[PDB]
Design a protein around this ligand. Structure first.
Ligand SMILES: [Mg+2]
Ligand SMILES: [Mg+2]
Ligand SMILES: [Mg+2]
Ligand SMILES: [Mg+2]
Ligand SMILES: [Mg+2]
Ligand SMILES: [Mg+2]
Ligand SMILES: [Mg+2]
Ligand SMILES: [Mg+2]
Ligand SMILES: [Mg+2]
Ligand SMILES: [Mg+2]
Ligand SMILES: [Mg+2]
Ligand SMILES: [Mg+2]
Ligand SMILES: [Mg+2]
Ligand SMILES: [Mg+2]
Ligand SMILES: [Mg+2]
Ligand SMILES: [Mg+2]
Ligand SMILES: [Mg+2]
Ligand SMILES: [Mg+2]
Ligand SMILES: [Mg+2]
Ligand SMILES: [Mg+2]
Ligand SMILES: [Mg+2]
Ligand SMILES: [Mg+2]
Ligand SMILES: [Mg+2]
Ligand SMILES: [Mg+2]
Ligand SMILES: [Mg+2]
Ligand SMILES: [Mg+2]
Ligand SMILES: [Zn+2]
Lengths: 99, 129, 150, 24, 139
RNA sequence: UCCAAACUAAUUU
RNA sequence: GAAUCAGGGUUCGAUUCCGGAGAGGGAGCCUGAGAAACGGCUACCACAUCCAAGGAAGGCAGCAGGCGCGCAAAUUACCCACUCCCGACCCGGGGAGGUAGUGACGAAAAAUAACAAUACAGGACCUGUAAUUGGAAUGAGUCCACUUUAAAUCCUUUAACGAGGAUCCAUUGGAGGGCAAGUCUGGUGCCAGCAGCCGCGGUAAUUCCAGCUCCAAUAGCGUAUAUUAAAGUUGCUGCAGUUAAAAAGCUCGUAGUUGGAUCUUUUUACUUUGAAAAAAUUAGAGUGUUCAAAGCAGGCCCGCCUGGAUACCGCAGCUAGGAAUAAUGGAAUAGGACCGCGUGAGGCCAUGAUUAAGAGGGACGGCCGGGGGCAUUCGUAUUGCGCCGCUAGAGGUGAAAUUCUUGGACCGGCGCAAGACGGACCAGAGCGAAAGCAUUUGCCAAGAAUGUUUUCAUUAAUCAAGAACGAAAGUCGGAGGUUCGAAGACGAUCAGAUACCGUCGUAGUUCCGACCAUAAACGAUGCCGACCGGCGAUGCGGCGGCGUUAUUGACCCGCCGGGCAGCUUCCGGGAAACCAAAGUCUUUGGGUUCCGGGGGGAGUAUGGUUGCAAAGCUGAAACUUAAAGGAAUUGACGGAAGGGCACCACCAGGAGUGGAGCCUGCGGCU
């Protein structure tokens, strides 16, 4: 039987979307199917921010960011616990988890 | 495309009946529909209907009393002799007590009880009950 | 819907109810017919004659002023084209695609649209042959059609 | 048996029958 | 759906005549291949000659030995297997003995727990096997 | 993200 | 015509009536009004009969009969008396026909007990039960006679006999469930056996073999096979096709099928009626064959009266009414009706062209789009290479090793080269018939939607045959080869590992030109059309509206139309999951195309066809099997995820046991 109303992907008005590669194992995934995760993790690891900033040659130096857009196949995103399985009524819910 | 105007008229009257609406638009008005509605109106299932003339095939607004169960059409318009008419009666009508099969005979568009009186057959248009 | 497209678009004209000529149009039926005689001398098809009269003269419909359609007025005087205008424009379109297809012959989309356009030509010439507009021996050859248009 | 490979075995068998009848 | 128009009788009659072939009871009663394949040849009974007494093992979960005979027909020379129905009616039959066989219930299909057997013996040497069983007649 | 295969013919609820 | 049958149907019709055909196979003929005759000739083939071997004669698919074939079918009987036929005929002849025999093909009728008293049981004076008793009634059978009939026989009639265990004896199938009827008794012990189907039987068998009881239908009843209903499991009425079997990859397209509105409120189709239609059969009228199946008879006191009906008989053809529906036809180069008048000159017709589809084609307008083709430009990256710098490791994995490195690997810097690829932006957004489509710019042709008081005037919808397109892989030519990488070679892992993981690496991946025609080519959902709830968005076009902002755009608030979607709903539907379509379906009919019929065998075999090949298309059967399957529910389990817990679990430990001798328990041996 059919499990989701879209077929686990966001392809509605087109026939073929181009594929990307999973950043964890390089599986070919269509672009709309893949679990996208944009991370703006700081490059400093704030346990270390009070050591880099005291050792700087500046005083007001805002530390840069790191902009990585990760992609995942369904196999890797479950195994990395990016996503989880949900109940049957709780699948019908598209609001992202809060911050 | 639209091959049959009477079918789209009776399907729209039937859908508005079970929705409980009072009035309904019937798009293109032919004279066969007007002669079909009068037979429904003389036996009293529908109210007065207003015909709108717009210099092409017009529109008909029909008042619904709330009495109609099912107005259906029969496609194609099979020729029906008086010998075979009672076999159409127990395939279309829910009872021998009410309901009508509408024929188009040479003396005009008739219900089936009138065609027995006039002793003539014709092609079948539809039915209502 | 459309004949060779999956378009269901509605979008057409809508003539008003009263077909009486408006009072502000001070222009007789002869003065419109003479006007149509000159615009057709300039080589204009009957579709784009009614556009000029509508946009510049207030004549919303020729057949309400004069009682006759524009193509009936031209056929009565000999200013009618030999081919009908809508068949002329399907043939003129089928030349530009087939000239395009000489040079761009990997263009499989134009090869597809040329089949659709020419299928309309043969459905349309079937109609004008049974209405006795075109002669019954009239065929559409692709190799000789370029001289008939433009 | 994955029916994809049950087709593949049925190709290779039909492959083999064609050249048995070719040589006769 | 289906065509309903007033002149579509040929389309309806021919489509029906083609789609009749897709069920089993019409197909076997009109090809003639299955009529070619049963050894009765469209008959209800046949006389044959017992060649051999054969033991047929029952399909599981049943665990008995079904007593049958290997019979060659007189009509066409086809060799079949017929069941011998009752407690100990194999002892009434000998070899080279002329029997009468009939069908076994399911109109050509195999019946019960006997694999590949679709016939039973009726008369044994012009005497019905039900009479030898009940002691009505003697050989 | 180390390897991890198999399971009376001996039957009765 | 027959069987079945609600309405439709399905199957059968060798078979007594009508018509045809043939007389072992074919062929040729004579005679005659009529024959290509066969109870007529003539051949040849096949077969077969007598024979003195020289010859001669043959045709039972006529009645009987026999052989053979087989599951399968009657007496070498009597008669022209009836029915009729033929002849020269009131007289003769008829294996036509009639009558008997054989006849459980079948159909109709109908015995095998009834009563009374007791013995008893009951019920609110009535009834039941009895191997108790009682004489009353009859046929079966035997049997004179009549009758019957050609002579008989049978039935009908009537004497004579003819019943108590009224022995003058009712069988055939069953008893777990379907499905009416036993948890009785004895035997057997997964044996013998039953059982259509599910099943039963391995030592208390409700199922076998028997006895007892009981049930069913009864002079009938099982069994096999064809077939009809059941079967709305062939679906015209009436089926399905999202996931159960199934909608073709997509579009074009000829046949075919189907086609908008419009007018009095010529050819057809249709409808009604009339004829003409073989009886039998069917329906059905009348009628006490003793009833009934039947039959066409009969009935009423010299005779009389009276029946031997009517209907039905598809379609086609014929006939007269009807003129709605549905086709079709008349006047547009007037070559037109109508009147007059000399091939002319005229009048005259209100002179003659429906509408402009919330059908369609075409023009036009400003747009819009990862649509298409050609060219062009760019971007880092990767790989290689040079040169420089410093170095001893680099790489790779779960861990490793193959591999690469003092000859300088990797890392850094600058530079070059080549070939791919177009990130982020990029969305439940767009475009395309689908496959598919993303750097910049130019060129070429296309197209939807919107706008429109333009144009044509039904030009349309769906479509066998046919046609164009059709990812990937694959094929054949050229070119190119950076990355990746089937096959291949190694390194590991492993019981094995010709796999997963690593290191290399062919074809291929790239382009140009041909092929190939399939995909989970999926929304697993044909197309065209109509109607049927809301709501918030989105994309394009149009229109309107406070105000912001820039020098017609950008925002804002709505409205309209096409589009891709979402949420929500007891519209309704559905086996449900779910769907605003999968709704408007037993209240069953908008048009039309393709296609399914338990699972397997099998998309196999063969044949045809297409292709260079690989293969595509078309496509069985034998045989086999009682399920296979879909949806949902509860458990169980998961080398699935969340929570939580336990020294019969771990951690931190302690004491140990496992080693020794002995004690004692179990296996084994004896
Ligand atoms: Mg795809
Ligand atoms: Mg089309
Ligand atoms: Mg003859
Ligand atoms: Mg013979
Ligand atoms: Mg002869
Ligand atoms: Mg004879
Ligand atoms: Mg018989
Ligand atoms: Mg009987
Ligand atoms: Mg008796
Ligand atoms: Mg039973
Ligand atoms: Mg049936
Ligand atoms: Mg039925
Ligand atoms: Mg079905
Ligand atoms: Mg399926
Ligand atoms: Mg599809
Ligand atoms: Mg019409
Ligand atoms: Mg980019
Ligand atoms: Mg085709
Ligand atoms: Mg390809
Ligand atoms: Mg090559
Ligand atoms: Mg590997
Ligand atoms: Mg390739
Ligand atoms: Mg396919
Ligand atoms: Mg459906
Ligand atoms: Mg239906
Ligand atoms: Mg099947
Ligand atoms: Zn992955």
């Amino acid at each position: 039987t059919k499990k989701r109303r879209n077929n686990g992907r966001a392809k509605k008005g087109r026939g073929h979307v181009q594929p990307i590669r999973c950043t964890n194992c390089a599986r070919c995934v269509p672009k709309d199917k893949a679990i996208k995760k944009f991370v703006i993790r700081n490059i400093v690891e704030a346990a270390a921010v009070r050591d880099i900033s005291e050792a700087s040659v500046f005083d007001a130096y805002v530390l840069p960011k790191l902009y990585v857009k990760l992609h995942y196949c369904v196999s890797c995103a479950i195994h990395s616990k990016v996503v989880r399985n949900r109940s049957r009524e709780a699948r019908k819910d598209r609001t992202p988890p809060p911050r | 495309v639209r091959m049959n105007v009477l079918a789209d008229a009776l399907k729209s009257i039937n859908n508005a009946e079970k929705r409980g609406k009072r009035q309904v638009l019937i798009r293109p008005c032919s004279k066969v529909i007007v002669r079909f509605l009068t037979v429904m109106m003389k036996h009293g299932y529908i109210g007065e209907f207003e015909i709108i003339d717009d210099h092409r095939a017009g529109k008909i607004v029909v008042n619904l009393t709330g009495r109609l169960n099912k107005c259906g059409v029969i496609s194609p318009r099979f020729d029906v002799q008086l010998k075979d008419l009672e076999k159409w009666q127990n395939n279309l009508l829910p009872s021998r007590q009410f309901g009508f099969i509408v024929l188009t005979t040479s003396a005009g568009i008739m219900d089936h009880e009138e065609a027995r009186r006039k002793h003539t057959g014709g092609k079948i248009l539809g039915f209502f009950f | 819907g459309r004949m060779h497209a999956p378009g269901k678009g509605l979008s057409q004209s809508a003539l008003p109810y009263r077909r009486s000529v408006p009072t502000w149009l001070k222009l007789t039926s002869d003065d419109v017919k003479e006007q149509i005689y000159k615009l057709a001398k300039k080589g204009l098809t009957p579709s784009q004659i009614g556009v000029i009269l509508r946009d510049s003269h207030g004549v919303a419909q020729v057949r309400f002023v004069t009682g006759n359609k524009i193509l009936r007025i031209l056929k009565s005087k000999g200013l009618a084209p030999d081919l009908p205008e809508d068949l002329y424009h399907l043939i003129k379109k089928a030349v530009a695609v087939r000239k395009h297809l000489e040079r761009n012959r990997k263009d499989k989309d134009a090869k597809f649209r040329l089949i659709l356009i020419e299928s309309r030509i043969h459905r349309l010439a079937r109609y004008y042959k049974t209405k006795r507009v075109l002669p019954p021996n009239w065929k559409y050859e692709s190799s000789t059609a370029s001289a008939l248009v433009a | 048996m994955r029916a994809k490979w049950r087709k593949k075995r049925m190709r290779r068998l039909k492959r083999k029958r064609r050249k048995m009848r070719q040589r006769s | 759906g289906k065509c309903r128009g007033l002149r579509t009788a040929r389309k309806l009659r021919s489509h029906r005549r083609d789609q009749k072939w897709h069920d089993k009871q019409y197909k076997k009663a009109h090809l003639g291949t299955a009529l070619k394949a049963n050894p009765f040849g469209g008959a209800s009974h046949a006389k044959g000659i017992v060649l051999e007494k054969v033991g047929v093992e029952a399909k599981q979960p049943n665990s008995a030995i079904r007593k049958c005979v290997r019979v060659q027909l007189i009509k066409n020379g086809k060799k079949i297997t017929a069941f011998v129905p009752n407690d100990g009616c194999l002892n009434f039959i000998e070899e080279n003995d002329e029997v009468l066989v009939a069908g076994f219930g399911r109109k050509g299909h195999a019946v019960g727990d006997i694999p590949g057997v679709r016939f039973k013996v009726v008369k044994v040497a012009n005497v019905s096997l039900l009479a030898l069983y009940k002691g009505k007649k003697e050989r």
